[PDB]
Amino acid sequence: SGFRKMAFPSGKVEGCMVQVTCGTTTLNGLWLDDVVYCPRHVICTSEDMLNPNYEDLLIRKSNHNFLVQAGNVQLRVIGHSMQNCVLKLKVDTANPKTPKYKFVRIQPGQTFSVLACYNGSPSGVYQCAMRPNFTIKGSFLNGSCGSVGFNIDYDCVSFCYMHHMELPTGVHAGTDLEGNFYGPFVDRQTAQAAGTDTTITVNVLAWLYAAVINGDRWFLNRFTTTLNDFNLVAMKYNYEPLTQDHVDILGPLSAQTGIAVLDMCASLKELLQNGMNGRTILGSALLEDEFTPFDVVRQCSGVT
Amino acid sequence: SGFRKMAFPSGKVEGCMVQVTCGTTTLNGLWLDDVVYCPRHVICTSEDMLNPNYEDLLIRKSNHNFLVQAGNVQLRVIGHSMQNCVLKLKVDTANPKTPKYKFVRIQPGQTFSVLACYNGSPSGVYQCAMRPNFTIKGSFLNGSCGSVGFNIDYDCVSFCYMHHMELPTGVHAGTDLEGNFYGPFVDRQTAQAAGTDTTITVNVLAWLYAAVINGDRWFLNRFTTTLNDFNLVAMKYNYEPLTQDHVDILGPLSAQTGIAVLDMCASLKELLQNGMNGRTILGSALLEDEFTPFDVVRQCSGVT
Numbered sequence: 271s272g273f274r275k276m277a278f279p280s281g282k283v284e285g286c287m288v289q290v291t292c293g294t295t296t297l298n299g300l301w302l303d304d305v306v307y308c309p310r311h312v313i314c315t316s317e318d319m320l321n322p323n324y325e326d327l328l329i330r331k332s333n334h335n336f337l338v339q340a341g342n343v344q345l346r347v348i349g350h351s352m353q354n355c356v357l358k359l360k361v362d363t364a365n366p367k368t369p370k371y372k373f374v375r376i377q378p379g380q381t382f383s384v385l386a387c388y389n390g391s392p393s394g395v396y397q398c399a400m401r402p403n404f405t406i407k408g409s410f411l412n413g414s415c416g417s418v419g420f421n422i423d424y425d426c427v428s429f430c431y432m433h434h435m436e437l438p439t440g441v442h443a444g445t446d447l448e449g450n451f452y453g454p455f456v457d458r459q460t461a462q463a464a465g466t467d468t469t470i471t472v473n474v475l476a477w478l479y480a481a482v483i484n485g486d487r488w489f490l491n492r493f494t495t496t497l498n499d500f501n502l503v504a505m506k507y508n509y510e511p512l513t514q515d516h517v518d519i520l521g522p523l524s525a526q527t528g529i530a531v532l533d534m535c536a537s538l539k540e541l542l543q544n545g546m547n548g549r550t551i552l553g554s555a556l557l558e559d560e561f562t563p564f565d566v567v568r569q570c571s572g573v574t
Numbered sequence: 575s576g577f578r579k580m581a582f583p584s585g586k587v588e589g590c591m592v593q594v595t596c597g598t599t600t601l602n603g604l605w606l607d608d609v610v611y612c613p614r615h616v617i618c619t620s621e622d623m624l625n626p627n628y629e630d631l632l633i634r635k636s637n638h639n640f641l642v643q644a645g646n647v648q649l650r651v652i653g654h655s656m657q658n659c660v661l662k663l664k665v666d667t668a669n670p671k672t673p674k675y676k677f678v679r680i681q682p683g684q685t686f687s688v689l690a691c692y693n694g695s696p697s698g699v700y701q702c703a704m705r706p707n708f709t710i711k712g713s714f715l716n717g718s719c720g721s722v723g724f725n726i727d728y729d730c731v732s733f734c735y736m737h738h739m740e741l742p743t744g745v746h747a748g749t750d751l752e753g754n755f756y757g758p759f760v761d762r763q764t765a766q767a768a769g770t771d772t773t774i775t776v777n778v779l780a781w782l783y784a785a786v787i788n789g790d791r792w793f794l795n796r797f798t799t800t801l802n803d804f805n806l807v808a809m810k811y812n813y814e815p816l817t818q819d820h821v822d823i824l825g826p827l828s829a830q831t832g833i834a835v836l837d838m839c840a841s842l843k844e845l846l847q848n849g850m851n852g853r854t855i856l857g858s859a860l861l862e863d864e865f866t867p868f869d870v871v872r873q874c875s876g877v878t
């Protein structure tokens with residue numbers, strides 16, 4: 271029993287974290303095989319950050335201008351290429367600690383673990399969700415760029431996120447490992463506002479299912495509802511519209527608890543309309559939406 | 575900017591996790607040098623769990639009855655001893671991945687990272703606090719016993735907690751790595767109730783200081799108070815009495831923010847007396863008390 275905001279063990283990803291310096295700018299890099307992946311804004315001075323022409327800035331740079339440091343040993347850069355918003359620095363040594371890995375682009379609502387790094391050195395690990403406005407509410411300072419978000423399938427590390435920048439609103443924007451930004455964000459110091467940070471409805475229901483499993487059942491009521499009827503209330507409360515796909519994905523949790531998905535929707539509907547009334551579900555005074563149905567099944571069944 | 579419930583990177587501790595089997599009972603073990611540390615209740619059958627005489631149960635056991643598995647290789651047990659509530663199995667191989675490590679006994683209110691393990695395989699990592707009633711609100715299933723709580727000082731792992739059992743109340747009890755239980759808990763299946771789970775006042779103030787740093791300042795008011803006056807309100811709200819030591823420890827946060835500790839106490843006093851009024855501080859609808867003053871300074875200054 272007990273339910274916690276769990277991150278994947280970072281060990282496999284710690285072994286891939288390196289320090290990438292270009293001039294006065296130092297940030298984190300991901301070393302998989304004989305390639306080091308980092309944000310392309312490593313080449314930018316504070317002068318450039320406003321309106322940088324990356325292709326033009328990159329012409330000035332050579333292999334020897336990119337200083338890659340793993341632990342306290344220097345890696346020899348033998349080639350550099352720009353793919354979208356990330357730099358790929360080819361080194362002469364394959365990372366001996368390279369795990370089984372994939373580069374996946376996650377959908378909004380999907381969760382991942384973040385290893386926050388500074389000068390290629392991991393500082394902490396926390397669990398995260400790709401917000402429906404393609405932001406993430408991380409904990410990042412300066413020199414955190416290159417810190418990666420990942421999921422582990424037993425021994426295979428699916429790298430989904432690289433951190434690039436913080437918006438003036440205090441939330442975070444980044445790319446997949448192909449350098450394509452999540453949402454409409456560009457690596458520029460410009461007026462960029464996040465959209466509506468809607469609540470991940472399917473994740474809340476999974477977390478309500480998690481609450482029932484762990485014995486927090488006060489919120490369970492005598493009502494059911496319909497997708498259409500629930501979605502009217504969800505719209506009003508800036509919740510994501512719930513689909514038949516979401517219901518199907520919650521099927522396992524529905525089966526294990528013996529609570530129909532639409533009965534749990536009715537309990538959620540009442541919590542939106544009435545609030546908590548000063549009560550807590552799994553030691554939280556608001557409805558947590560950073561646990562996927564998969565996260566709950568994983569944590570509740572003890573997947574290693 | 576941004577503030578997250580951060581755990582230490584688990585990599586160093588992942589390399590110390592092994593599977594310890596005694597009969598039908600499998601649980602996690604900590605392999606440091608040529609010693610494997612696990613809960614002594616590994617020797618217990620379900621029959622024993624009610625009223626076990628561990629010394630008498632242990633007479634029946636030999637070195638060869640303890641099956642230690644690191645990854646998918648078997649370790650040879652060449653000696654076993656019972657220290658309090660943990661078993662120390664001496665193996666013929668020193669753990670090649672043994673980090674710099676200490677065995678520290680933490681005080682209630684102190685925070686640590688937990689690597690939740692099953693069959694010696696790490697499943698997830700989450701940050702925790704030793705509750706003032708010497709319980710922890712972890713996420714643990716069956717076979718989680720031997721999962722350890724730790725703090726990292728750069729490259730040195732201070733092991734503070736080993737998980738032993740869940741109380742019928744759904745909270746968790748465990749030992750330091752000398753086998754001494756936190757609080758009055760015994761490794762028995764018996765009527766054991768936790769004391770009052772009081773709020774860690776100093777941790778809340780640190781987290782309020784963290785909120786101000788990250789730009790959540792709505793709760794800052796025009797009032798100050800005194801230790802004695804604040805402590806009257808704290809008592810009423812089942813908060814830990816705040817001492818001069820706590821004020822001194824918050825000094826750095828007080829200096830950086832330019833907010834006197836007793837002015838922040840006055841803001842907390844009002845939040846206790848008035849509630850949140852449906853608002854959130856650092857995306858939380860209740861007052862978080864699982865961040866130490868040290869945790870906030872660490873996360874806000876990016877210590878690696």
Ligand SMILES: *CCC(=O)N(c1cc(C(C)(C)C)on1)[C@@H](C(=O)NC(C)(C)C)c1cccnc1
Binds near residue numbers: 412456
């Ligand atoms: C890791 C880089 C960094 O410190 N930042 C940053 C981003 C940029 C670009 C995208 C404008 C090139 O330059 N420096 C911070 C940041 O996002 N700052 C702006 C100016 C608000 C964009 C940053 C701070 C905290 C966390 N992550 C990044």
Ligand SMILES: *CCC(=O)N(c1cc(C(C)(C)C)on1)[C@@H](C(=O)NC(C)(C)C)c1cccnc1
Binds near residue numbers: 601615740761763
């Ligand atoms: C890891 C051992 C386990 O599954 N438990 C357990 C504890 C005990 C003793 C202390 C009675 C010997 O035997 N089995 C669970 C547990 O604490 N169960 C009781 C019966 C409620 C004590 C346990 C479950 C979930 C998380 N941790 C432990």
